Assembly symmetry: C3
Homo-oligomer: 106 residues x 3
């Protein structure tokens, strides 16, 4: 796919996570987030449409999505342990990371 | 690296997992699977031999092995929670992901 | 950022981990190690400053830091389970891996 839809999936599942009631919902939403982040690793953002796929910029873009995958992982750990509130709290910081990323590469 | 046999290693450790009797065997096979997935990140498959290490096709190859490493992780998490049979089910789905990769890239 | 400073962050947190007494200390230092390894994915090491960002050499350099992040992951899992000493042992081997990497690329 392409970058815009991966950002859309990320924010859709962040909203699911805020709205959720139990650990299972958070876990599934985080799985969709990790899938979307790994997918965005394959896309080229609008702002870097003019830069090479091997340019330093594209490397930092992909590594940023590896960092997002690892943060998602930690939140998924909280959700798998059953700590719904702590997972929701972690997801708020994930939202900070996602909105900043969308801001930069919009 | 050496793409050809990392696929062999993943298939053989899936054979190990299906045949396995205890939690320990599946975890060890999953750790060997993660090693093989990450290692395969370094190689070039046949289908991409005339392509750049940085070609978009090559980028998608490497990201696909990140996805495989993350799937393996979920399977290992299950085996670590004490859910040996749930882990073997996850491994069955890994079997579909891996042989899917053998086609297209061989 | 910068490669050698990432190496120094890894070495300092290895020391913190060996001297620590509780799971929280080990977890905090390993999370810092994971941050620094993922960051190092973004740098270019001295030995490869003559190579393309898309070179096979640079690809292997980045994949090695994916491997280091996964090993850090396993140690953090040990620390979360309450196995403080096993996490420290795992960290000693992380030190072996790090000093090998520091030698190869330097
Ligand atoms: Mg920095
Ligand atoms: Mg971890
Ligand atoms: Zn984990």
């Amino acid at each position: 796919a392409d970058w815009e839809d991966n950002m859309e999936t990320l924010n859709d599942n962040l909203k699911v996570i805020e709205k959720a009631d139990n650990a299972a919902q958070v876990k599934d939403a985080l799985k969709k987030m990790r899938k979307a982040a790994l997918d965005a690793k394959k896309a080229t953002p609008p702002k870097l449409e003019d830069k090479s796929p091997a340019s330093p910029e594209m490397i930092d873009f992909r590594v940023g999505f590896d960092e997002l995958a690892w943060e998602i992982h930690d939140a998924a750990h909280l959700a798998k342990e059953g700590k719904v509130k702590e997972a929701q709290a972690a997801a708020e910081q994930l939202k900070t990371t996602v909105n900043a990323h969308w801001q930069k590469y919009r």
